[PDB]
Ligand binder design. Sequence first.
Ligand code: Q0D
Length: 146
Amino acid sequence: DELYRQSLEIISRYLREQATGAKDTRSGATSRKALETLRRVGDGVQRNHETAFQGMLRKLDIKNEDDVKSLSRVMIHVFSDGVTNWGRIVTLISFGAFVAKHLKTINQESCIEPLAESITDVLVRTKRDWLVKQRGWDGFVEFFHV
Ligand SMILES: O=C(O)c1cc(SCCc2ccccc2)ccc1NS(=O)(=O)c1ccc2ccccc2c1
């Protein structure tokens, strides 16, 4: 699907840029604009939620490939319950970037791509309809202008 591929490209490229060293660009203007937006906001979110992010990472206890494949079950239970807003969407991806950083530390680089797939699957399978209503990643750029 077009929306899934767009979301997978934005989240993967951001997770790779944070955990490793980007970028080898590819996609359209909206994906390029959304990556820039998420780069600006994501830096601030990872700093402001640093303590929460560290505590949540400690709970998941990731050390092997099996642990990242199980993360999806915890993420869908938290992200589904409650209100849906752009703030919660960026913080979920920003947490993913923080997990991707930890994955580079524990020498599990090959798990960043399935982690990016996991977050995209959590975001799309839970909020696809809300995303279509907000004009997808175009609404994401418009909401995070300031
Ligand atoms: O926006 C989210 O819904 C959100 C979800 C995730 S998925 C990792 C889930 C997890 C929970 C508990 C322990 C380990 C992992 C990551 C970052 C997020 N950031 S958040 O906006 O700061 C937030 C919101 C509600 C929460 C309710 C209970 C516990 C934590 C929460 C965090």
